[PDB]
Paper text:
Here, we report the biochemical and structural characterization of OsUGT91C1, a glycosyltransferase from Oryza sativa, which is efficient at catalyzing β (1–2) glucosylation. OsUGT91C1 is able to catalyze the addition of both glucose 2-1-R1 and glucose 2-1-R2 with roughly equal efficiency. It also catalyzes a third reaction, β (1–6) glucose addition, to create previously uncharacterized compounds. The enzyme’s ability to bind steviol glycoside substrate in three modes underlies its flexibility to catalyze β (1–2) glucosylation in two distinct orientations as well as β (1–6) glucosylation.
We chose STB, which lacks the R2 glycan, as a means to obtain a complex with the R1 end at the catalytic site. We could build both glucose 1-R1 and glucose 2-1-R1 into the electron density at the active site. Compared to the complexes with the R2 end at the catalytic site, the steviol aglycone of STB has undergone a 180° rotation to swap the R1 and R2 ends. The position and volume occupied by the steviol aglycone in this rotated arrangement are very similar to those complexes with R2 glycans at the catalytic site. In addition to steviol aglycone rotation, glucose 1-R1 of STB undergoes a 180° flip around the glycosidic bond to the aglycone. As a result of the flip, it is 6-hydroxyl, not 2-hydroxyl of glucose 1-R1, hydrogen-bonded to His27. In this orientation, glucose 1-R1 does not form a bidentate hydrogen bond with Glu283 but retains the hydrogen bonds of the 4-hydroxyl with Glu283 and Trp22. Glucose 2-1-R1 is found in a previously undisclosed pocket where it makes contact with His93, and its hydrophobic face stacks against the aromatic ring of Phe379. We believe that these interactions with glucose 2-1-R1 stabilize the flipped arrangement of glucose 1-R1. Guided by structure, we constructed three mutants H93A, H93W, and F379A, to suppress β (1–6) glucosylation by eliminating the cryptic glucose pocket seen for glucose 2-1-R1 in the STB complex.
Author numbering: 15 to 160, 201 to 459
The structure:
Amino acid sequence: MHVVICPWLAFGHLLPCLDLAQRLASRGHRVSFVSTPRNISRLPPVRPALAPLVAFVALPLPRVEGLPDGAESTNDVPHDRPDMVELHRRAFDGLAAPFSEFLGTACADWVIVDVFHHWAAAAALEHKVPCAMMLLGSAHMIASIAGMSLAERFSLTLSRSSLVVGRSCVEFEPETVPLLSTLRGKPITFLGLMPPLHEGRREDGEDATVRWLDAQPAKSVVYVALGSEVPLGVEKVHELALGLELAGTRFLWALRKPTGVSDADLLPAGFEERTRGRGVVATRWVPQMSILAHAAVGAFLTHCGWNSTIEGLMFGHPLIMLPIFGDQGPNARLIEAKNAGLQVARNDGDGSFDREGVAAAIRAVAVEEESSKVFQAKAKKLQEIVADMACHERYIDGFIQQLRS
Ligand SMILES: C=C1C[C@@]23CC[C@H]4[C@@](C)(CCC[C@@]4(C)C(=O)O)[C@@H]2CC[C@]1(O[C@@H]1O[C@H](CO)[C@@H](O)[C@H](O)[C@H]1O[C@@H]1O[C@H](CO)[C@@H](O)[C@H](O)[C@H]1O)C3
Ligand SMILES: O=c1ccn([C@@H]2O[C@H](COP(=O)(O)OP(=O)(O)O)[C@@H](O)[C@H]2O)c(=O)[nH]1
């Protein structure tokens, strides 16, 4: 088959979609991976053996008064500047005509589009190509669901699609998957957890963060990362920093800068001096797979993005969960229900957190002997399912069979 894949302009969508493209191309299918040129330039290279089976289709973002050049992804357009988010959604919707012209002569058997690709589902109808909507989260997230707002883009895309695709399996969510047939009349299929192939990410294993981990004792380091895009304002960065200090563990922290905050204001006065040698903060993209694979990392403090949830559990890390938006609440509650992590306590009213809730969550999951040992044993049980790479490949074969029918 020829499959056209159109991910949302966001690295938590681009990365698993490129992995999927390569898994289809491995079974002898052809893929057109459609995105914007700077997003494509920042992706890991395709295995040379799949090179002619994964065609990159670069559609340049239309210039929209005030959207900076190169600002192509949710990693470049900050959630704390909603004016710029809106400008980015306009640029995205401007891909409609270049995309419809491309699909016309693509000889596509299937279009696989992301949640906001309402124009791509419409092109699919125009050119009579079956259209699958990617909803590459948990069964629990999909059960919860069962210009324009995100809700209207989603509903329009869903209305124009014939198939909805989730990233889970009955083995991980036996209580939800057998209950699901359709999302608003559209058949649901699960292509498995599709945990990333470590090699496929092509990270630097000489990265300074990994060389720091090499000097730490086994299971001693709390890895802290909130994915590629969720906002965390400076007051909340300070509370997370002071929480990490109060719990007293070693930590490696991948931190994104809130817009308009200087290097001097970023972190509490003297925080880096007081934690020097015990903790490292990196305000750059880190090799998350090499970090989670490392013997020194014990617990993962995660925003519970679905990629970070799968990646954390596939290496048997118990989770300290700080969900920010979207599917992260459901993802966090799902893992808490399996006893493999604990949410940071939140105020009902604003959803805020403080240093003490952060510290208490780290202590219970990573420090207190009795609780920490239960969290590790429960994360290990989840790893048996999440890291069953053969099982997940069989789910990709199952999804390809769903598409031929
Ligand atoms: C993956 C997702 C599909 C989504 C579509 C809308 C949907 C969901 C919110 C589920 C419930 C029904 C419904 C219709 C709704 O709007 O209430 C659904 C799941 C999360 C979602 O997340 C988005 O992910 C992107 C990266 O992964 C962000 O670039 C984006 O910005 C998130 O959208 C965010 O949605 C949050 C929840 O409403 C908001 O708090 C946040 O401001 C918004 O950006 C948004
Ligand atoms: O510094 C970073 C931050 C994120 N990631 C990767 O980016 C993705 C983040 O996706 P997730 O669903 O966890 O969160 P999102 O960015 O969509 O909120 C995951 O595959 C991570 O391995 C990374 O490699 N380095």
